Amino acid sequence: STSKIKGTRICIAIRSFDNPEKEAWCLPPHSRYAAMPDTRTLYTVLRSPHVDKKSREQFEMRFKKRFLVIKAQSHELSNKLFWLKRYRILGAQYELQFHCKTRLDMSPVLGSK
Amino acid sequence: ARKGNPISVRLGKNRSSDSSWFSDYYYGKFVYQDVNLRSYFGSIRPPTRLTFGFRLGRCILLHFPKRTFIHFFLPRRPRRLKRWWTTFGKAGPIGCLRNEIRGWPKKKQRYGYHDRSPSIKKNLSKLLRISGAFKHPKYAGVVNDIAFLIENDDSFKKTKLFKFFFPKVRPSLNFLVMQYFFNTKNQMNFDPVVVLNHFVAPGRSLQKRIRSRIAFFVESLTSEKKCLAEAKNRLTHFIRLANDLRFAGTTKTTISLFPFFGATFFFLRDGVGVYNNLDAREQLLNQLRVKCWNLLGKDKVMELIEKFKNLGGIEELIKVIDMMIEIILRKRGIPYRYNSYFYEVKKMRSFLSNRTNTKTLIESVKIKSVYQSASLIAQDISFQLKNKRRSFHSIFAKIVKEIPKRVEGIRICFSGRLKDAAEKAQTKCYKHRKTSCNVFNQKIDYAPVEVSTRYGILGVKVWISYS
Amino acid sequence: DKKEEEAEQEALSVFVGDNADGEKFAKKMGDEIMAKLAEGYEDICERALPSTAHDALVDAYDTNLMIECEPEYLMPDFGSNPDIDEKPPMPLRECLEKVKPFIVALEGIKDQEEWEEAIGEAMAEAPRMKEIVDHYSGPDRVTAKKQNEELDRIATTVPQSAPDSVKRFADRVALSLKSNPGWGFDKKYQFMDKLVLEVSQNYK
Amino acid sequence: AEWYPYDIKNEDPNVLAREEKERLSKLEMLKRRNKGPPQKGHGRRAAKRNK
Amino acid sequence: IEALLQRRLADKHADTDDEVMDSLQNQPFKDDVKDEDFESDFEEAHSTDDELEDLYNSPEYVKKKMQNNEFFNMDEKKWDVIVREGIRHGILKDTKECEEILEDMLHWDKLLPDDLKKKVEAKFNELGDMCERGEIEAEAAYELFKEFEDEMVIQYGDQDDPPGKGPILRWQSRIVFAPGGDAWHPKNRKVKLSVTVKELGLSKHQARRLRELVGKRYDSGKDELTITSERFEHREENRKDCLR
Amino acid sequence: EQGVKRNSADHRRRLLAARFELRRKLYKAFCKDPELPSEMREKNRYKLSKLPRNSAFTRIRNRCVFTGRSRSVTELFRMSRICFRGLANKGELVGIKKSSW
RNA sequence: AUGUGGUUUAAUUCGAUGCAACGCGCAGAACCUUACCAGCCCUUGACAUAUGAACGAGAAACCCUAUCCUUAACGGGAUGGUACUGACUUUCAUACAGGUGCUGCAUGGCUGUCGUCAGCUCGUGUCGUGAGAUGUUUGGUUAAGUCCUAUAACGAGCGAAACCCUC
Ligand SMILES: [K+]
Ligand SMILES: [K+]
Ligand SMILES: [Mg+2]
Ligand SMILES: [Mg+2]
Ligand SMILES: [Mg+2]
Ligand SMILES: [Mg+2]
Ligand SMILES: [Mg+2]
Ligand SMILES: [Mg+2]
Ligand SMILES: [Mg+2]
Ligand SMILES: [Mg+2]
Ligand SMILES: [Mg+2]
Ligand SMILES: [Mg+2]
Ligand SMILES: [Mg+2]
Ligand SMILES: [Mg+2]
Secondary structure, eight states: OOSOOOSSEEEEEEEESSOGGGSGGGSOOOSEEEEOOOEEEEEEEESSSSSOTTOEEEEEEEEEEEEEEEEOOSSSHHHHHHHHTTOOOTTEEEEEEEEEEEEOOOTTTTTOO | OOOOOHHHHTSSSSOOOSEEOOOSTTHHHHHHHHHHHHHHHTTSSOOOSSOOOOOOOOOEEEEETTEEEEEEEEEOOOOOOOOOSSOOSSSOSOOOOOOOSSOOOOOOOSSSOOOOOOOOHHHHHHHHHHSSOOOSHHHHHHHHHHHHHHHHOHHHHSSHHHHHHOOOOOHHHHHHHHHHHHHHHTTOOOOHHHHTTTTOOOOOOHHHHHHHHHHHHHHHSOOOOSOSHHHHHHHTOTTHHHHHHTSOOOOOOOOOOSTTHHHHHHHHHTTOOSOOOHHHHHHHHHHHHHHHHHHSOSSOHHHHHHHHHHOSOTTHHHHHHHHHHHHHHHHHOSOSSOOHHHHHHHHHHHHHHHHHTSEEEEEEEEESOSTTOHHHHHHHHHHHHHSOOSOHHHHHHHHHHTOOTTEEEEEEEEEEOOSSSOOSOEEEEEEEEOOOTTOTTSEEEEEEEEEEOSSSEEEEEEEEEEO | OHHHHHHHHHHHHHHHOOTHHHHHHHHHTOSHHHHHHHHHHHHHHTTSSOOHHHHHHHHHHHHHHHHHTOGGGOOOOTTOOOOTTOOOOOOHHHHTTTTHHHHHHHHOOOSHHHHHHHHHHHHHHHHHHHHHHHHHTOSOOOOHHHHHHHHHHHHHTOOTTSOHHHHHHHHHHHHHHHTOTTSOHHHHHHHHHHHHHHHHTTOO | OOSSOOOGGGTOHHHHHHHHHHHHHHHHHHHTTTOSOOOTTOOHHHHHHHO | OHHHHHHHHHOSSHHHHHHHHHHHHHSOOOOOOOHHHHHHHHHHHSOBOSSOSOSSSHHHHHHHHHHTOTTSSOOHHHHHHHHHHHHHTTSSOOOHHHHHHHHHHHOSTTTSOHHHHHHHHHHHHHHHHHHHHOTTOTTTHHHHHHHHHHHHHHHHHOOOOOSSSSOEEEEEEEEEEOSSSOOOOGGGGOEEEEEESGGGTOOHHHHHHHHHHHSTTEETTTTEEEEEEOSSSSHHHHHHHHHO | OOSOSTTHHHHHHHHHHHHHHHHHHHHHHHTTOTTSOHHHHHHHHHHHHTSOGGGSGGGOOOOOSSSOOOSSEETTTTEEHHHHHHHHHHTOSSSEEEOOO
């Protein structure tokens, strides 16, 4: 199926200046792949160290983001976290999102029902 | 609206930057660190008259979480070709001598370099030499059969284990104590049973199974203390010990399981370098022994035989020879055949790692000629003009004559007071073959440099095209 | 090639001195305390003489400890709930005993003597690992329950002779400092201490 | 307080030695032609006022 | 060595020799390297490259050198393969008995039948009764009787959501892996927990009072009560705050 | 301490303000509750006014770290426009490339 | 509203001056910035390196969750407490440190303009005593020495176009 993975899982958010698809080998294995919009920031500077007001040069800074989905059951999350702590992705910073489920203890509040 | 830098137009495509990282909260630290490190590295070991010097062409910096990698590129020395045992002055002029709840947190920094910090490598070395020394006979058997396997079996070579382990205190309680201290210092509840999944690889004895279940039940339901009549029962309650020693056997194999030292060997793989001095180590191993064996005993055997006749405490002579071996290594100064280049590189990595709190690495590459980057060519021209020997036409002619092939054109501009008699500064430009900067799929490199002179500042610009 | 070999020989002989004393020692006492002294020399040689492989394995160990022992990467068991009541931690000697049969079945340990020797080497190696984790992890954490208890206590350390408005002001300042993650705890209790000191300067 | 960072050239003692050698060399090339700084408290206006 | 041997014998200046060791091990020396010695070892330490032809594509060269490293990035599947092959070649030990004993340590109250639990409990009660008197040689004979009746009991014996039961929580937590050796990031300390209101089984008036007490942390289309904590400096502290 | 002569006074001001940050917030906290006694408000206003004026955060000016220019300083890069353009043309500052559209 | 000249003032900081200066340097002047003026201060100095003396085997400077008094304010005088110092701290002396002082008509680097106008040259060959010329002198087309044809010239290089980004 192509429906959304909802449950126990890992989500990796990778932010970079370059495209991560240029070096695809350093990415972790994953179930799903998607991309976010690029974000640009504009700078306009004077060219001269003195009065040349109408001459400008325009630079930009561009941010790129990618989203990875990993399906994982409850027993192997602590196994995968050890390796996920030690990765080396080229020119990137990654974000580890953890989705897990526990249960509620009702004993100290069941008196109030 | 004037002529601009060639690199800025083709920075994205057809070229790549010298650094690779990303941050948003820590951008201002890295954008300063790049500029500061590249400004520092270019002023190290300048060429004298009798030295070729350190000529850095491109410095490549890669940033990873807590690990930073630096790659240097240097040209080979152009030259036409054809002791340690006694040294002095390389040593010491003096042997020295004549809030319980109200604690403080970890201090942070965001924008610059950390403060100067004492190191921990002495304690790490002390832990590693007297812990896990792998001289145990329980570890002696496994290296024997791995030596049998490597020299005779090709299926061991064609196997991923060889390709990782050899790219051409027992450890379990150590990790348990590590995990206990790391959990109790940050005040998270430490259950040691769930730690045991680290010592687990998921990829007949049912009587023992039920006996273990009931032997865990008998230790769960008990321990209601303050009773001596049942403390006698606790004394005869050593069926927990039966459950302990039920699973025992003779083991022939060591452990390469539990991925915590697998990661240590994984880090050892990628940071070995290219240099080792085991030959110079083993040359001194058997010679310092015969030096220290014949040094003592020079009509001064009376103190040694007094030490022998005192008691069986001879092992303080081991501390005596510790002091003497420290004295003899300190007097000469610097290791025996350790390369000075790797000495300076290691000394460089040490202060970089301490100031930034990472584990930085330095990898060097030697290339064939100085004509492989505009920065190298401009540095060469500036060093040639620093002592006046040649004219500008002669320098350009020599560069054109000994330029290597695969360079599709060159151009050099000199500006300043070129002629000594005249005061009005002019510009001289020399060109050769194709230097069309307006084609964006060409490979054009550019570099400036400034020369101090008697009459001010001279300037040199270099454009070079590649095929 | 005569010059370098003659130079190393003249340096080596003047390093080694005169070879009477080593043979005199070989004759004097015997070979067994020489074997003991040779093992002592062997354990020196892994400290005194530098080894590139030793320093590289120390660096790889340093990298592994730097990644592993970081307080910002901690994630506990994924099938558990928090310990709200904050039970005190069981001691290390008792923690090593309820783990016994797994590591006995795993690591080796042929009998109780081998077990106790392993426990001895672990317990004697333990105190310097506290210094290791002191260098890596940091000082401590101090839980927010105790932080709020201390902040409430210094709010109750006001003098009695002050008006009730000052006491309400102190309790409200402690309440608004209670939920501030952008302040250091040292700065928080410094702020409360200085407020109490300034009021006590005029309400003796 | 962290706005002005630390310069990593300050830890290597070779480069500061070469910089101080260049400062001294410039000072000596000024001193060899009697264009160096005067004595403190003995400036030109002080000597003219004493004259 | 004569002088320090004599002072080892005297044992009066024993406070000095340890500081001799500290000074000789710690205090720096004149570690200068002349530039000819700096350059002469470099070319015998490194060999000339043969494939560059220019330094224009230096980053791509370094990145390809790192791409060729097969063990650049490593994961648990790779460790599982290299732990299967070492078991196959006989250098490594199978861990089947270790997971068998770990399952016993984790879950013994679920697999042990209660009809056996009550009879072994009665056996412990009678043996603790007979141990207090001490007339049965309870140090060893009681343990022997325990082993005999335990063998008798073993002869009688030998013939997706989370575990357990209750309302189910859902957690969310973030770790930022920043480069450069400075680890603290502001996104570290935020924890969210989600719960379904109807699983608590509250009455209608109790649910209305909950909704009034909550406000907009309740989402009606999903019956989702979500509590987020950022007010504490550490991730576990925010988790505990969410549960409280 | 940092090397650039023209940034020395502003660096001194930054250190002096980071020293006195705690007392300034404390007296500003006392002066903002009107239910508090008038004499205590007056005393805290006096002690806040007696603080060193160079320790005030409004005297701190952003200057360029490589040069010391007092105008047109981008806070993200901490460099002035001239240093920023010179380093961006070469290809040094990461991320920033030319821009067209 | 804002900039400039002029005028006045203790000071009204300086630069930019036809096109190509004048909402320009200034993408932020209440104090700071600030370069200008008036008072109150300091002199190896707010900061660096070296040498030579003096003090100190733990004192002094230094610092603080500091306190009080006095100054328009910087500062100055007391009172507390912690911690450190021997290839190391401080104090004094002299080499000096320092300068938004002048010269853009001594310079590097950076920029405006002629000008996105289509131009500016070189190597061999030929003509001319020579400076020089031809190539780049025909007939057309093009935004364009862009392309064809013709031509004692044959070929190159920097420019044009395309390669680049975006819709
Ligand atoms: K010609
Ligand atoms: K055109
Ligand atoms: Mg200046
Ligand atoms: Mg401001
Ligand atoms: Mg003017
Ligand atoms: Mg102009
Ligand atoms: Mg002023
Ligand atoms: Mg003003
Ligand atoms: Mg001035
Ligand atoms: Mg000019
Ligand atoms: Mg002018
Ligand atoms: Mg023309
Ligand atoms: Mg012509
Ligand atoms: Mg053309």
